[PDB]
Design an enzyme around this catalytic site. Structure first.
Site: not given
Ligand code: VO4
Length: 298
Positions: A180, A214, A220-221, A261
């Site tokens: 994450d 995710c 990640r998405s 992110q």
């Molecule tokens: O679970 V994510 O913080 O890669 O949107």
């Protein structure tokens, strides 16, 4: 040219500034439904909501809300549904959405437990002989088989609408080693996984949009979808120079807030697209190099 820009940014050490510029320019649309009091327990994160205009509506009169956005990439001609990791009370909504949207694949980029915290409900069965029934949405879910690799697993699931007894096969692609707020271990292991999803048919236009999630469904998405869309765009006219990565991410951020992110995730997106362009441009052997370099065996 993305490669020219990539080096010019590395040389000046300015990924943070580039990434913040995208943050500053990104779209801002209302998320009024997500913020209704009755939907408080349907949101995993207070600051991660679907825009009203692009949110997925459940086909139920009671409460049609789920934290899920439709990313509809018009020029690339591919859609994705990005959603948070289902909560213990939204697993039925999640599979209802898969059913109603006619999805053929679920891409999960997180683990159930990350850094000591529960990031996602256990929303699929881990054992063939222990199937799941979601009473609220009248769906049955059964594990059919697993193909376990070193850093990812592919699951064949059977989803049944208990009301009509129709059954569908769902493919589950579970990336186990993507931290994450982090990046994949290499371009090769990300691209190897991405092409495994492609090769399953789960991204065909004959199917509903693939579900990508995710924990929050943005970082990640977002990275996964940006790389895929950029490779598809460049595949359409075999012209890597026609792809503006930052423009594509901004276009995606019209449909869901916060996609990608961190600045290093942006930087990784460039690496993956640049490496994947080798395949798009006619070098098919590179696909097997990724499989090798990914060390997927054992
Ligand atoms: O679970 V994510 O913080 O890669 O949107």
């Amino acid at each position: 040219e993305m490669e020219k820009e990539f080096e010019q940014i590395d040389k000046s050490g300015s990924w943070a500034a580039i990434y913040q510029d995208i943050r500053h320019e990104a779209s801002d649309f209302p998320c009024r439904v997500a913020k209704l009091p009755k939907n408080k327990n349907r949101n995993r994160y207070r600051d991660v909501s679907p825009f009203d205009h692009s949110r997925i509506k459940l086909h139920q009169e009671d409460n049609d809300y789920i934290n899920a956005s439709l990313i509809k990439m018009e020029e690339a001609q591919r859609s994705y549904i990005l959603t948070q990791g289902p909560l213990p009370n939204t697993c039925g909504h999640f599979w209802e959405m898969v059913w109603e949207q006619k999805s053929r694949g679920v891409v999960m980029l997180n683990r159930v437990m990350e850094k000591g915290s529960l990031k996602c409900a256990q929303y699929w069965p881990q054992k063939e002989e222990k199937e799941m029934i979601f009473e609220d949405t009248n769906l049955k879910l059964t594990l059919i088989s697993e193909d376990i690799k070193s850093y990812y697993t592919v699951r064949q699931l059977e989803l049944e609408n208990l009301t009509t007894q129709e059954t569908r096969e769902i493919l589950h692609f579970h990336y186990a080693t993507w931290p994450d707020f982090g990046v994949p271990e290499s371009p090769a292991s990300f691209l190897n996984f991405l092409f495994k999803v492609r090769e399953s048919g789960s991204l065909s236009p004959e199917h509903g949009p693939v579900v990508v999630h995710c924990s929050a469904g943005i970082g990640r998405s977002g990275t996964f979808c940006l790389a895929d869309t950029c490779l598809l765009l460049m595949d359409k006219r075999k012209d890597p120079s026609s792809v503006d990565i930052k423009k594509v991410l901004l276009e995606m951020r019209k449909f869901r807030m916060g996609l990608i992110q961190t600045a290093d995730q942006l930087r990784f997106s460039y690496l993956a697209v640049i490496e994947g362009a080798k395949f798009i441009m006619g070098d098919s052997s590179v696909q097997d190099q990724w499989k090798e370099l990914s060390h997927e065996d054992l």
